[PDB]
Amino acid sequence: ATKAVCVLKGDGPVQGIINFEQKESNGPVKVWGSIKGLTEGLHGFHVHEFGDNTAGCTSAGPHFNPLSRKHGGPKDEERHVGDLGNVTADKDGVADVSIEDSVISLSGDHCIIGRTLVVHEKADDLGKGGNEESTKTGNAGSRLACGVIGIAQ
Template sequence: MPKAVCVLNGDVSGTIFFDQKDDKSPVVVSGEVNGLSKGKHGFHVHEFGDNTNGCTSAGPHFNPNNQDHGAPDAAIRHVGDLGNIEATTSGGVTKVCIQDSQISLSGPNSIIGRTIVVHGDPDDLGVGGHELSKTTGNAGARIACGVIGLANLNSYQLYMYSGMLVQILYTISRVV
């Protein structure tokens, strides 16, 4: 299976990786987002890989089954509904680690060529009662985005290795 990557640029920036063992396995979404305000932020795959007019050009959430917006574990949801990522401090590094069984790196639910959008507010997961809850999760402004593309496997493996090394060194420093 291919691997994929998305680079977020701007005041909020980061790199998101997508890995799927085979077409029946869930996609593992991992990476880092920098510069978020403290709190939860909606995190979605949007329909188009078009950022010509900023994140607005990405269109609505990726929703090939024409469902209402929902939580990542809800039976009824957009394919692109990945919930929230949470920044524990303002302006720092936010780790992303999501496993999702609806998105794919191939087939009809493929996210290759679509856009990841990070929103300014929390996603209410479709249950907030706001007029936008069932379409966008009332997640607010689009503050960062990037097109999901096929990854160069050499770069992907190097980044993943360096990330594991940093985590190992951090863990060792906490123990010592």
């Protein structure tokens, strides 16, 4: 109900721990932790629809988008619920993740508990990449690491 955690793993060296915390049922979720094993630069950071890892990260399915809008960035009006933008890996990289968000929730309808958090191959282009798949997914590439979002102590 108020604190959640995701452990990120996949086929290569990308791994990390992401914590979620919601002080109040209608306020923002704080999101923090870190990821290592990343190429330097920007990586897409999304909640996808299914907490399903039967066949790797791909079974998590598409972006979590229960309001059925177009893909944008976290500060856009038009975005998926799961559009948490990009995280920035440093040169050792290492992304230190520190985010607040008012669309995702740990309770109710937009609830992300039991869904999959994914860190992608390249930058999320945020709807502004000028082709079809940019408006659907932001061309962030392949799924380097994922993890089902679970109830934390």
